[PDB]
Symmetry: D2
Subunit: 297 residues, 4 copies
């Protein structure tokens, strides 16, 4: 019922997730340009496969890069093409004023050539809805890791979730629902109250030492050094640390290794564990945002 006819999009690069986007945009009758897909028989009606120097940027209303957009040299990551794909300044200049670029995470090079071309760059992984929606595949990732790195059942174990942010809330809820005894560490009184209303056990992150002495699994959400040497000193090798924070994560890895503590940094859970879902999530937010651009012209 909601359409995107009279828009012209370039999908440059991607993985299993971009397929969901492409699927979505063709359902919404956008005019689609595909670069980085020459190998795959996607089965996507109407879509036109070409290189980056054969895209008519003059007419392009939007560019959809992959989640981790570009390397140093600015090469776009493809998985369904052998030909290396590179995004240049010049490409973004040939582009209308109202043209918006979409990517997942930050990148000095992409922010550069976008500020330089005076074109808007939306960093999806920074919106709340994307983080929140993405917490779902990320719990499922976390559950998966815990199941396969322990000899015991999640149910009835002692589980700490560090931080009650957009994902922490989801991790703690789902772990509790799975039957674990879940405790949560936060700092704001608001988070501590919510924890208790959710029926969980709250501790302040100042007391992290005392509250992880004897826990079975410790899941970190805090994008900072919280699982410091002083705190790991109190832990036993009975504890699995699943650290979900963005690199360099939240835990003194060298020290843990020393103490015989398995501490895993697990970047990119959604893409790894549920690409159809991870993909549908971006596709849906993207279809909402593109629609707004279209209503204005």
């Amino acid at each position: 019922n909601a359409m995107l006819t009279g828009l012209k999009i370039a999908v440059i690069g991607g993985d299993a997730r971009q397929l969901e986007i492409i699927r979505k945009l063709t359902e919404q009758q956008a005019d689609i340009y595909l670069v980085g897909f020459d190998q795959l028989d996607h089965g996507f009606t109407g879509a036109v496969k070409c290189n980056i120097d054969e895209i008519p940027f003059q007419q392009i209303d939007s560019i959809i890069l992959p989640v981790s957009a570009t390397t140093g040299e600015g090469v776009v990551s493809t998985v369904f093409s052998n030909e290396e794909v590179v995004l240049k300044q010049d490409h973004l200049d040939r582009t209308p004023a109202h043209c918006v670029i979409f990517s997942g995470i930050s990148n000095a090079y992409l922010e550069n050539i976008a500020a330089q071309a005076k074109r808007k760059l939306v960093k999806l992984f920074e919106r709340d809805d994307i983080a929140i929606y993405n917490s779902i595949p990320t719990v499922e990732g976390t559950i998966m890791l815990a199941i396969q790195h322990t000899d015991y059942t999640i149910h009835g174990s002692q589980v700490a979730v560090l931080g009650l942010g957009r994902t922490g809330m989801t991790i703690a809820r789902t772990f509790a629902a799975l039957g674990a005894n879940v405790k949560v560490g936060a700092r704001s009184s608001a988070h501590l109250a919510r924890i208790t209303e959710m029926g969980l056990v709250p501790f302040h992150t100042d007391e992290l030492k005392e509250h992880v002495k004897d826990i079975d699994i410790c899941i970190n959400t805090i994008p900072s050094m919280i699982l410091n040497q002083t705190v790991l000193s109190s832990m036993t090798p009975k504890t699995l640390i699943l650290d979900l924070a963005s690199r360099p994560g939240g835990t003194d890895f060298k020290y843990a290794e020393k103490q015989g503590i398995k501490a895993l940094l697990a970047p990119g859970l959604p893409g790894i564990v549920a690409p159809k879902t991870a993909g549908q999530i971006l596709a849906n937010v993207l279809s909402k945002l593109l629609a707004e651009i279209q209503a204005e012209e």
Copy 2:
């Protein structure tokens, strides 16, 4: 072990709720002056019953007032006293610099005489943690209200909760727990996304009309008149509206009435339904805040 020894505090007036407050402060060995409690059948450890004119204000580190501090002319509300208790400007002036006045909701008279006295006034109900803790007693209230004004079972019914704010989140989780088919309406994309992670049905409040056409119970949270004449026009008399938003609520009651719709505004639900717990919440936050004041000197 967390104590409150070197502390002078007046507790002036109160409900059943205040009984919990005194209880905690006296467990914590504070020095207390109780006015408005002559009619109470017992005492507390460390506190005297006296008059406002009897208290040594020059030394008081904190004053505690009822949820609803004062009525115009300075009268403090008392449930446990025959004698009318009036708080004067002169009282607060006699007070040292660091002294904190605690209350619940806003009140013109109190704010005046306090700012005038150059003394800090903390209205506890504007804090997030209070609001979040209180949402629990308030669902219980709302559950109560739903059981009595319906001849059907909450379980398996259609319930809308409007708003995923501090309390709305608790109302939604709880009616879901209890077996209703809960949809929740909100405006922000993060709310919309969280409503889905919690396994509920989200809608945008711009669709309010369409999503309340056929529901059994519509619990409102939003401080704005969203249940307006035009939304109600296509609701049926079969709907119960339970309005928890503060005066003036969220609904065109007058119209609902004509339409044959039971819409009920339900203020101060924590106070009515679980006075002990309502009181225990205030006490617990009050404790924390006084430990801070005690730490400055």
Copy 3:
């Protein structure tokens, strides 16, 4: 699902029976309605008559109210100024396959049905009714819990006695409401189940030790266990909601002497949620009545 070729007598009843008649007319059963003269709306394909005016020879089922009848055999109508008595001969004129449905147990009814060689189903005794009914019964228990305490169900200490049909529902619901629930049973399988549901299990032999410091004790066991020696550990702080059938599972006269509020709550579904209660009945009957029709 149609009861097209089925003659059914509904005799006496309350709001709930109306619900059944509704559903049974929806399915185009031929209904005979006795003890409903004081009612002013009718029912499609239903004839209001006297008990002595029904062709019992052709009735395939007979439906009585929840509390079947008195010792003298008079059915409890709410919808008639006139007194209706069910006799042995009514049931003898009835065909071999005719089923009498009622709710609870009754000596007179069991006797006349047995002497008539006629199947008497007591619905409140069947698992599904017990289970469907457990829902409106928690809500009732919740209700009582809310109005009889000054504290919140959330974060309280709750004990539920018996993981039977209703107790199962009573525990999951209270736990989901954020109460700390522990449940006493006796069989190992019940204790396993309690453990899986994430709740704290104890054995009813340990009952004195496990109810010292609870806030609400909810009872489901139809046998005396909240007794004088147990009760003597508990303190007036504790609230007992005994849901078991009369006499209950509590030494109430003792709870009295100790100052413990202990309530007997019979017939919660009918009180808390009459529309639902009647639908539960209605729906099972319709499922059951089709089974009868499936043979002839």
Copy 4:
């Protein structure tokens, strides 16, 4: 407090599971003869490692065998032994009257030589509480399988669980807690009601074909040919079938493979997925039962 002090027990072969069992019995100060573990890197307090011919059976109060007790020729499975342990009739014959033998599942050889020795044989897996305790580690195994065999999230999918028996209950409950949309098929009036009170969608299995047309995941718990060719012909390749029932499950796996449908048989999930919990579950039941033998004598 519950001690097994005056008791002589032989533990003959077994898994990592048996370690938890031994750990428990030794903690209860039983006297243990441990055969099948020469190759374990540590020992236990109060138990000697030995050979079956070294066991003083004439005094053994009880013999504890592996989950799958024994082969046809009488060999006992040992994962911690080079040497081949074989259990003879003569061994049970030497044993005293009250002596009880414990094993996991059924098996003829054992069954036979017990009966012929006139000695009590308890098969643990046939117990209600074992079955239910094990359901927990088994859902987690199932969750794992779901996660590893799909490219989408469990949250928000269509899940069908077949049967509400001892494990079906746990399975249906836990996938629902994961945020799936769970329907469950049973046949008793009583199970159907239970399902509905559980807040899930019930159906009768007579209707299976109808209800699995659009499911993402189908979990069978029924030890009968239910997921048959005629049912399977309605399904689409998109569906994943997890068959948890004992070999040969409830599926036409040969038809399912032809139709392009992945269907898995997943035997002994507790053992694979959480051996510590499997073991502990077994020990706590064993401990409780050996206490009955001790009381009797």
